[PDB]
Amino acid sequence: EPTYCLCNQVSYGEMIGCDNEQCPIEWFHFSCVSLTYKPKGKWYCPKCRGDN
Amino acid sequence: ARTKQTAR
Ligand SMILES: [Zn+2]
Ligand SMILES: [Zn+2]
């Protein structure tokens, strides 16, 4: 029932959480943020890291 | 990073 990411779809596969505690979305699907492997260190979603 | 595998 709950949806996440920029696509606003349910949880599926591997998801990564934005390290900004105040991120409005928080969880994103790896594919939606062009990731294949768990990043090392802090990770911020496109919105929080300043992308358009 | 913080990641999780979808479960259930
Ligand atoms: Zn997505
Ligand atoms: Zn964020």
Residue-range definition of the domain harbouring residue A17: 1-52
Cβ contacts below 8 Å, chain A against chain B, sum to 30
Residues by chain with Cβ below 5 Å of ion ligand 1:
A 5, 7, 29, 32
Q: How was this structure determined?
A: X-ray
- Where residue A6 sits, what CATH number does that domain have? 3.30.40.10
Instruction: Annotate chain A with DSSP letters as a single string.
Output: --EETTTTEE--SEEEE-S-TT-SS-EEETGGGT-SSPPSS----HHHHT--
Whole-angstrom Cα distance, residue A21 to residue A35? 21
Quick one: which ligand is closest to A19's CA? 2
Own/partner long-range contacts of A32-39 (Cβ < 8 Å, ≥24 apart): A32/A5, A32/A6, A32/A7, A38/A14, A38/B1, A38/B3, A39/B1
Does residue A33 contact residue A46 with C-beta atoms inside 8 Å?
yes
Cα radius of gyration (chain B):
7
Give the count of domains, chain A. Answer: 1
